[PDB]
Structures are given as structure tokens and as C-alpha cells.
Amino acid sequence: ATVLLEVPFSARGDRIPDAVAELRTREPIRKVRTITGAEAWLVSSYALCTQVLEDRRFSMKETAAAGAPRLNALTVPPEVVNNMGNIADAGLRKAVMKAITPKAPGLEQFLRDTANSLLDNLITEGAPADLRNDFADPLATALHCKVLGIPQEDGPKLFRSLSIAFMSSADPIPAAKINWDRDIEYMAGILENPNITTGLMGELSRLRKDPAYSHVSDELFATIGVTFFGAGVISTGSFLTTALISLIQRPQLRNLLHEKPELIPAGVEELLRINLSFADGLPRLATADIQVGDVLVRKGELVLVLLEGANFDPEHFPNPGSIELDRPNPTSHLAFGRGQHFCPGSALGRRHAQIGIEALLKKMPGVDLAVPIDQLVWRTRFQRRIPERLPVLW
Ligand code: HEM
Numbered sequence: 410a411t412v413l414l415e416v417p418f419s420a421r422g423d424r425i426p427d428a429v430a431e432l433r434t435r436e437p438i439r440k441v442r443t444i445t446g447a448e449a450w451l452v453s454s455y456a457l458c459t460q461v462l463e464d465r466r467f468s469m470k471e472t473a474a475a476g477a478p479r480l481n482a483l484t485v486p487p488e489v490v491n492n493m494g495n496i497a498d499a500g501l502r503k504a505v506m507k508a509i510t511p512k513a514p515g516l517e518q519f520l521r522d523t524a525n526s527l528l529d530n531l532i533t534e535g536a537p538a539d540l541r542n543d544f545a546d547p548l549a550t551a552l553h554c555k556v557l558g559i560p561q562e563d564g565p566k567l568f569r570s571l572s573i574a575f576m577s578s579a580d581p582i583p584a585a586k587i588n589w590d591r592d593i594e595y596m597a598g599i600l601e602n603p604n605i606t607t608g609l610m611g612e613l614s615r616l617r618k619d620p621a622y623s624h625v626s627d628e629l630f631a632t633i634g635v636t637f638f639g640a641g642v643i644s645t646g647s648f649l650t651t652a653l654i655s656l657i658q659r660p661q662l663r664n665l666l667h668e669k670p671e672l673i674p675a676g677v678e679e680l681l682r683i684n685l686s687f688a689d690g691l692p693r694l695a696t697a698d699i700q701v702g703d704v705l706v707r708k709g710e711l712v713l714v715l716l717e718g719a720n721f722d723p724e725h726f727p728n729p730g731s732i733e734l735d736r737p738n739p740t741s742h743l744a745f746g747r748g749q750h751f752c753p754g755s756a757l758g759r760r761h762a763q764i765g766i767e768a769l770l771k772k773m774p775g776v777d778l779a780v781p782i783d784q785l786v787w788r789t790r791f792q793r794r795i796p797e798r799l800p801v802l803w
């Protein structure tokens with residue numbers, strides 16, 4: 410006898426397991442066991458992933474219901490699982506969405522300046538350099554302080570909550586509550602702090618005193634700050650780190666983007682498509698009995714949408730493991746999700762990566778790994794796949 414197939418399959422974010430394609434061919438929806446011991450349906454074709462993400466009877470917020478089968482333990486209060494629903498119900502969606510585009514005057518200049526400063530520091534100090542801790546993640550952290558309107562010097566302490574906040578644990582995590590409560594208190598103080606007048610938090614600070622929002626809770630305003638900083642920083646920092654590995658691995662693409670930087674947006678879209686940064690399928694709970702391929706999913710069951718199952722599906726993306734800058738469907742990947750919960754940070758996340766890559770290629774056109782690729786240490790039991798350090802030379 411063998412056990413029920415366990416997820417996740419591998420924490421390594423530099424290569425997809427050959428097992429994913431086998432799985433998608435033989436059983437593109439199949440039962441698995443999660444780290445909590447719960448059963449779930451793992452969906453791994455493009456067709457069935459899209460079906461689940463576009464059908465709201467597969468619910469995000471019902472994953473937080475007490476007693477549901479769980480992918481992992483909550484690290485936020487259960488009402489925060491419906492965060493963007495709560496933002497929309499408060500009449501804040503338009504405003505929040507507006508504040509996190511890359512469009513604000515000065516923002517792109519700020520990202521280039523910041524990327525260049527981090528890279529000049531690395532060049533002064535001499536190789537090897539850690540492009541996760543000393544480039545991608547500080548770039549993400551600086552970006553999100555600017556987008557929120559909060560002091561750059563408050564970035565590092567907020568960032569150090571994230572290695573716990575974004576854990577994928579079988580059990581509740583006592584430090585996640587300590588850091589959540591502390592970070593909520595910080596964002597409630599930001600809303601009361603008259604120096605904060607710009608960015609997302611400057612905007613929510615004004616809307617909080619406007620009569621159209623007088624009954625929106627102070628708790629929701631603070632929660633938007635904590636959640637958007639943390640999710641945006643983890644998602645952009647982790648994507649840019651694993652995208653740099655994929656680029657550094659492909660010297661010809663490196664050289665092509667360095668020579669023709671106008672191709673960087675197409676190259677970032679393919680780096681998004683192939684990205685392995687999400688460590689787990691996206692979870693949903695069925696609220697009805699729903700047919701998915703050859704399975705009737707029953708009400709109350711957990712479904713996990715494997716993004717790399719969709720994004721490496723050769724029926725949708727032929728020669729799926731190759732980066733090709735001339736595909737006829739380049740933005741049709743699921744790296745930002747699909748449907749009701751499609752990422753509102755997508756444009757910002759694209760621009761963070763495009764600017765970080767353009768700056769890296771101009772400053773370190775010879776960038777290469779400084780260790781054999783197998784020596785990267787992949788973080789485990791985390792909601793993202795990320796190497797703990799990314800040592801490079803140039
Ligand atoms: C390259 C970077 C990013 C990637 C790959 C990414 C990916 C995703 C994915 C896959 C989803 C859908 C989750 C689901 O349907 O279960 C999502 C949702 C979300 N993302 Fe992003 N994200 C990125 C950057 C951002 C940024 C910069 C922010 C904000 C500053 C952000 C905020 C959100 C929020 C608030 C949601 C929830 C939307 C909802 O429930 O409707 N993300 N992201």
C-alpha cells in the first residue's frame with residue numbers, strides 16, 4: 410500500500426516536477442492530502458483551472474469556515490480571508506485599486522532609482538551578492554512603502570513579519586498572531602499620523618474622515634494596509650527572485666533583453682507564465698455539487714488550483730517550458746489568477762519586475778549564479794517558493 414498523494418510536491422522553485430505533466434495527462438483533477446491531513450481535489454489542466462477560478466460556487470471566503478477541510482492553518486483572522494470583498498462592500502475598491510497601479514507620478518522613477526542604488530551598493534561591496542536579500546526583497550519593500558505612503562525606514566520591520574505571516578503550516582502559528590496584532594497597531598497609528606498624506610494610506614486616511622465612510626470600521630482601514638503591504642511585498646519579491654533565476658539560467662535571453670530592453674515586458678510576461686513562486690494550489694471550497702472533468706466535486710470539499718498545472722499545459726502553451734516572446738496568447742496565463750479574485754496588483758507587479766530586470770541587466774550584464782544551482786536552499790512550508798539566498802557574480 411501507498412499513501413494518498415501528498416501536496417505540495419516540491420518546494421524547489423527552479424524546475425517543475427516531471428510529475429506535474431504526468432498528472433495533468435492521466436488525471437487533471439485528482440484527490441490529494443494536504444499538510445493538515447485534509448483531502449482535496451488538485452486541478453492541474455488549464456481548462457479545469459480556469460473553470461474552477463471562473464465559477465464563484467468555488468468560494469474563496471468559504472475556505473475560512475470553521476470545520477472545513479484546510480490546505481493550511483489561517484494566519485489572519487477568518488474575516489480577512491474575504492479581504493477584497495470587505496473592501497468592495499465598504500465602497501473602497503475603486504480607490505484602493507487606483508492607489509496600487511504603477512501610474513502615480515514619480516513611482517516608476519522611484520523604482521528605477523531604488524533598483525540602481527541597491528545594485529551600485531552590491532557592485533561597491535564586490536561579488537558575490539545575494540539578489541534576494543539585498544536586491545529583490547528590498548526593492549519590493551521600498552516599492553510598497555512608497556505605494557502605501559509610509560516611511561521607508563519602517564519597511565524592514567514590516568518585512569521581517571513575512572517569513573512567518575506567509576507560512577503554510579498544518580497548525581496555527583503563535584508568532585503570526587503576535588506580528589499581525591503589532592502590524593495592525595502600526596497601521597492604525599499611520600491612519601492617525603498627520604505626516605501620512607500620500608499613497609494608499611494617505612488616501613484611506615482621508616476617506617476615513619469623509620461622511621460617505623463614517624461607518625467603515627477602523628479595523629478594516631488598518632487591515633487594508635497590513636494585507637496589501639504583506640501580500641504585495643511577498644508576491645513581488647518572491648516573483649522577481651525566481652524570475653531572476655530563470656533569466657540568469659538563459660544567457661541568450663539575458664543577452665537578448667540586455668541588447669533590446671524594449672522586449673523586457675514580453676520577457677516578464679513569459680517569466681510570469683513559467684513562474685513557480687506559488688507553493689500551493691489556490692484554495693476554494695465548493696458551495697454546491699459541481700462537475701469538474703470526470704469528478705463530481707461535492708459541497709464542502711476543498712479544491713486546489715495548481716497555477717503551474719495551467720501555465721505549463723502544452724494544450725494551451727505549446728513548448729510550455731520554453732520562454733518565447735512571440736506567443737499568440739502571452740497574457741492568458743494564470744499567474745495573477747482569473748475571475749472574481751484576479752490580482753488587483755498585476756500592473757504594479759509587472760512594473761516592479763520589468764524595472765528591476767532592466768536595472769540589473771544594465772548594471773550587471775555579466776550576471777551569473779555564483780554557486781551551482783542545486784546549492785540554493787528552498788524555503789519549506791511557506792506560501793511561496795523562494796531560495797533563502799540567491800548568490801550571484803557578474
Ligand atoms: C508578481 C506579483 C504578484 C503575483 C504573482 C500575484 C498573484 C496573485 C494571484 C494568483 C491572486 C489570486 C488569488 C486567488 O484567486 O486565490 C492574487 C490576488 C490578490 N493580489 Fe496579487 N500578486 C502579485 C502582486 C500583488 C501586489 C503588488 C498586490 C498589492 C499591492 C497584490 C494584491 C492582491 C490582492 C489584494 C489579491 C486578492 C484579490 C481578491 O481576493 O479579489 N498582489 N495575486
Ligand SMILES: Nc1ccc2nccc(-n3cncn3)c2c1
Nearest residue numbers: 484485574585589635636639640
Ligand atoms: N499573519 C499575517 C501577518 C501579516 C500579514 N500581512 C499581509 C498578509 C498576510 N497574510 C494573508 N494571508 C496570509 N498572510 C499576513 C498574515
Ligand SMILES: Nc1ccc2nccc(-n3cncn3)c2c1
Nearest residue numbers: 492493636637640641644752754
Ligand atoms: N497577492 C496575493 C496573492 C494571493 C492572495 N490570496 C489570497 C488573498 C490575498 N490577498 C488579499 N488581500 C491581500 N492579499 C492574496 C494576495
